[PDB]
From Swiss-Prot:
Catalytic activity, as annotated: Hydrolysis of (1->4)-beta-linkages between N-acetylmuramic acid and N-acetyl-D-glucosamine residues in a peptidoglycan and between N-acetyl-D-glucosamine residues in chitodextrins
Binding residue positions for substrate: L32, F104, S117, N132
Effect of E11 to A/F/H/M/N: Complete loss of enzymatic activity
Effect of T26H: Facilitates transglycosylation more effectively than hydrolysis; covalently bound substrate
Record field: pH dependence: Optimum pH is 7.3.
HAMAP family given in the database record: ENDOLYSIN_T4
Induction: Expressed late in the viral replication.
Protein name stated in the entry: Endolysin
UniProt keyword annotations, A-Z: Antimicrobial, Bacteriolytic enzyme, Cytolysis, Glycosidase, Host cell lysis by virus, Host cytoplasm, Hydrolase, Viral release from host cell
Cellular compartment(s): Host cytoplasm
Length: 162
């Protein structure tokens, strides 16, 4: 298991524009297009992202290419983030993937907002961090995915994904 297989399980793969759990236009493996209500604004973001006129449909290769960019960008955003970096540096390989997953889902700003949980993770207080992480909109809105990520932080294993 690795970050790509983990996120592929969590996000799925869709080759036609769709709406995410929040009602936003998305495509591929969790690639957010726009938060705007307009489908045309989404087709336009999509063509710009891909470099061709797509008419709302992409190929497997194109989805995977966006996926590779998004993972790379999540990692880079964590390392540039003054709040996230020290947490990331402190974690083992498995838990680092858990943190990348949360950033990929909610953005670096959102994750950097879980102040108390981050402090707990850095301190290696696994059980306490798991309890604090669950007291969130994130956990309440997407409980199955949240539980998998939370179990990954708690155990430092890929058990929840196998
Ligand atoms: Cl893009
Ligand atoms: Cl879920």
């Amino acid at each position: 298991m690795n970050i790509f297989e983990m996120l592929r399980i969590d996000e799925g793969l869709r080759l036609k524009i769709y709406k995410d759990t929040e009602g936003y236009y998305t495509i591929g493996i969790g690639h957010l297009l726009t938060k705007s209500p307009s489908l045309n604004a989404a087709k336009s973001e999509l063509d710009k992202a891909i470099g061709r006129n797509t008419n709302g449909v992409i190929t497997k290769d194109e989805a995977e290419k966006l996926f590779n960019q998004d993972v790379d960008a999540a990692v880079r955003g964590i390392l540039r983030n003054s709040k996230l970096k020290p947490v990331y540096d402190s974690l083992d390989a498995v838990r680092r993937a858990a943190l990348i997953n949360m950033v990929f889902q909610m953005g670096e700003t959102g994750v950097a907002g879980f102040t108390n949980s981050l402090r707990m993770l850095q301190q290696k207080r696994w059980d306490e961090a798991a309890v604090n992480l669950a007291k969130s909109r994130w956990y309440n809105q997407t409980p199955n995915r949240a539980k998998r990520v939370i179990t990954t932080f708690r155990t430092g294993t890929w058990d929840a994904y196998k």
